[PDB]
Amino acid sequence: MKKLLIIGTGGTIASAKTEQGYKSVLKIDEILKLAKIKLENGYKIDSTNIMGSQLIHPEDWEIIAKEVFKALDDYDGIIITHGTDTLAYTASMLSFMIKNPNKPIVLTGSMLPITENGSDAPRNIRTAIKFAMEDVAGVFVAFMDKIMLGCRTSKVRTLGLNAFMSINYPDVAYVKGEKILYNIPKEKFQPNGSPELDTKYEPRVVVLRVTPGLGGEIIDAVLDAGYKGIVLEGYGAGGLPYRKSNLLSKIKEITPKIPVIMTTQALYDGVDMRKYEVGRKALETGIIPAKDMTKEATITKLMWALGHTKDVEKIREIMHTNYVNEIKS
Amino acid sequence: MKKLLIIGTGGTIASAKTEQGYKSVLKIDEILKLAKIKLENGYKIDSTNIMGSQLIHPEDWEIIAKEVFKALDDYDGIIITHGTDTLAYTASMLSFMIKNPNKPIVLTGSMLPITENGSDAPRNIRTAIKFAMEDVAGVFVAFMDKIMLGCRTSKVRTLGLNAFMSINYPDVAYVKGEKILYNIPKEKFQPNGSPELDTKYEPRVVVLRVTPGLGGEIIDAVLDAGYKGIVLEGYGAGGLPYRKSNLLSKIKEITPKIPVIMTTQALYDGVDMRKYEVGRKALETGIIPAKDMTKEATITKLMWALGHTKDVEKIREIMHTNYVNEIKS
């Protein structure tokens, strides 16, 4: 009946405790063996390893997108095991690089190595397999029995097993044993159009936390260092100091040439740069609101957008296009 | 019986909706009047305004600490109204600038202006007054009926009224009408020693989010721009790329001269740089773990520490000293 591909990429899920700490040591065949995954029953799993890796690099996104893209032809469902710390960047970036995928692409990981007592790895793989067997299409994350839209996922903690949340967006579904309870209607994830691959990206995006003290001298430094986009983890007021501070005036000097995106240091509820006068002053300088996007969506989307054009009005239109429900319309 | 001082500083709590957006317009006397606060019954409230402000600047911390410090002599309790976006930076910084305060110092704010329907401002002020009437000492935040240790508070969302959480640390208490339920024993917040004022700080700390793509060229740029400390919002693996990446090797070149602190982009559970080999490699470069500290504690503590010395071993010892339960021992 159904054919699944599981792609290994590294991560805690590929790791074992050593005398030098956790170390990425397992290929996907050993993960599947150590997590006691059934390779059949209404399906057949094939497995492959892309390329000691804990962390994804932007180059790896192009590699993974090409392999996933070629595989849509031969598989009903595609699972990617991945390090938790950068899984949400990968999930978001594939959501822009693979247009109209016509099969489920499901990323997962673990907080514990398989071989540690109480590991979450077997359960997360099993969840991902179950959802990958669904007649749906898009890029999803499977974690702690939840299915979440890839471009809306963030890692919220470093120890607790319920480590990924859907930010400012509903979960897709919840998997209890063999039952899938759709939180968003299944009919909403049907394939539309033919898949396309677009791997253009510019990686030199720098993300800053807006703090008291942060001066315009940083904006000078990041331009001197060659960076092409700036993400700010700003305030819910949505604005910057324009008094005892050159930050807003130094940004206003560069917004015609460099996209400056305003997201939040706060996790939940998004940025509204219109509610406060201080926000409206930040907008008036040409700072581009990230609205309800996650950090990981904001960042990967801007890298992808800069790969297409350096025209800041065109970047604004790309960032505010709702491609795959990464952002409100 | 008891004397309370309420200090105004600006914020949403001081704001009103105008045709140009929310605007800071109210002095503390008008806030108290519009929120219908009782200025007596077992107490007397005095009020004062420090110095159009939504956002605190590091300079304001010294001003507020001097005024709060002088006021310990004449008041049983001190309340500060403050903008929510930078309240947690202020609460943390006062926790290092005011040693062994012998009275409750309680910061609060609101998500809604007083004059907006359903405002949280009256309730937050009332909570802060109630806790300020307690025979305890330290720096606390009052929000949505909770009392939280100041140096453990973060703003987690931009719209929901329950906007502040206690991070990796229990709440101090919960206030239901006239009842205070102590979550940590009251006896644990008794005054010890005589209050001291220490307002030394270095503001040029830059906070970066660790992303895929982030190169060592940023470390060069921030040194050229004169910054004296770097906070990284890193990964739970606790490490950096040392492969297809010069980030870790450029940081290893500067850690003898510049403190580089590793905290998390994730909100909850802290950094453990020993669990993973990649973390141990980051430690071996002399990156200083922030452990369980909040971003706002990490950042203000480093600014305060740099105000005392530029010796990176002495900064490490300061950062890992548990002064006021900002960090685990």
Positive or negative torsion for Cα B90, B91, B93, B97: positive
Q: In whole angstroms, what is the distance from residue A71 CA to residue A6 CA?
A: 11
The answer to whether residues A327 and A120 touch, using CB atoms and an 8 Å cutoff, is no
User: Residue B142: left (phi > 0), alpha (psi -120 to 50), or beta?
Assistant: beta
Which positions ≥6 away from A125 have C-beta within 8 Å? A6, A13, A31, A32, A35, A37, A79, A81, A108
Closest residue of A to B270, CA-based? A158
Name the packing angle between helices A84-97 and A58-71 (round to 10°): 60
Q: In whole angstroms, what is the distance from residue A61 CA to residue B76 CA?
A: 59
Closest residue of A to B157, CA-based? A268
Give all domains of chain A, ordered by start, each with its CATH number. Answer: 2-197 (3.40.50.1170), 205-320 (3.40.50.40)
Catalytic site includes residue A9: no
Q: In whole angstroms, what is the distance from residue B98 CA to residue B198 CA?
A: 6
Classified as helix, coil or strand, B132 is: helix
- For residue B62, the tally of other CB atoms under 10 A from its CB is 16
Q: B104: buried, middle or exposed (CB in 10 Å: 19+, 13-18, 0-12)?
A: buried
Which residue among the candidates B84, B108, B127, B285 is catalytic per the annotation?
Answer: B84
Q: Write the single-letter amino acid at B256.
A: P
Q: In whole angstroms, what is the distance from residue B304 CA to residue B265 CA?
A: 22
Written as one string, the DSSP assignment of A36-63 is T--SBSSEEEEEEE-----S--HHHHHH
Measured between CB atoms, which of A58, A60, A84 is closest to B236?
A84
Q: In whole angstroms, what is the distance from residue B199 CA to residue B66 CA?
A: 8
Q: In whole angstroms, what is the distance from residue B174 CA to residue B146 CA?
A: 5
Q: In whole angstroms, what is the distance from residue B199 CA to residue B201 CA?
A: 6
Distances (CA, A) of A24 to A30, A119, A144, B241, B276: 12, 15, 22, 14, 9
Written as one string, the DSSP assignment of A204-268 is -EEEEE--TT--THHHHHHHHTT--EEEEEE-TT-----SS--HHHHHHHHTTTS-EEEEESSSB
- For residue B284, the tally of other CB atoms under 10 A from its CB is 11
Tell if the CB–CB gap between B21 and A278 is shorter than 8 Å. Answer: yes
H-run or E-run covering A84: helix A84-97
Q: In whole angstroms, what is the distance from residue B323 CA to residue B96 CA?
A: 8
Which residues of chain A does B203 touch, with a Cβ-Cβ cutoff of 8 Å? 212-213
Listed residue (B190, B45, B69, B12) closest to B129, CA to CA: B45
- For residue A226, the tally of other CB atoms under 10 A from its CB is 11
The answer to whether residues A237 and B155 touch, using CB atoms and an 8 Å cutoff, is no
Q: Write the single-letter amino acid at B44.
A: K
Measured between CB atoms, which of B85, B222, B279 is closest to A221?
B222
Which residue among the candidates A9, A81, A84, A86 is catalytic per the annotation?
Answer: A84
- For residue A143, the tally of other CB atoms under 10 A from its CB is 26
Listed residue (B216, B242, B237, B244) closest to A60, CA to CA: B244
What is the pairing mode between strands A146-149 and A173-176? antiparallel
Resolution in A: 1.9
Classified as helix, coil or strand, B113 is: coil
B17, B61, B64, B207: best mutation site toward chain A, by most A Cβ within 10 Å? Answer: B207
Method: X-ray
- φ, ψ of residue B315 to 5 degrees: the values are -60, -50
Distances (CA, A) of B108 to A99, A212, B81: 47, 18, 5
Q: In whole angstroms, what is the distance from residue A327 CA to residue A167 CA?
A: 10
Q: How close A40 gets to chain B, by Cα (Å)?
A: 33
Written as one string, the DSSP assignment of A116-127 is STT-SHHHHHHH
Distances (CA, A) of A310 to A229, A304, B215: 10, 11, 20
Provide the Cα torsion B282, B285, B286, B289; round to 10°. Answer: 0
Tell if the CB–CB gap between B266 and A156 is shorter than 8 Å. Answer: yes
Q: Write the single-letter amino acid at A145.
A: D
- φ, ψ of residue B249 to 5 degrees: the values are -70, -35
Q: A195: buried, middle or exposed (CB in 10 Å: 19+, 13-18, 0-12)?
A: middle
Positive or negative torsion for Cα B24, B25, B27, B29: negative
Measured between CB atoms, which of B89, B220, B274 is closest to A211?
B89
The answer to whether residues A157 and B269 touch, using CB atoms and an 8 Å cutoff, is yes
Q: In whole angstroms, what is the distance from residue B321 CA to residue B309 CA?
A: 15
Catalytic site includes residue A12: yes
Distances (CA, A) of B217 to A294, B213, B242, B244, B284: 25, 11, 14, 14, 21
The answer to whether residues B246 and B240 touch, using CB atoms and an 8 Å cutoff, is no
Written as one string, the DSSP assignment of A130-183 is HHHTSS--EEEEEETTEEEEGGGEEE-BSSSS--EEE-SS--SEEEETTEEEES
The answer to whether residues A89 and B265 touch, using CB atoms and an 8 Å cutoff, is no
Looking up tokens 């060069």 gives B220
Q: What is the C-alpha R_g of chain B?
A: 20
Q: B223: buried, middle or exposed (CB in 10 Å: 19+, 13-18, 0-12)?
A: middle
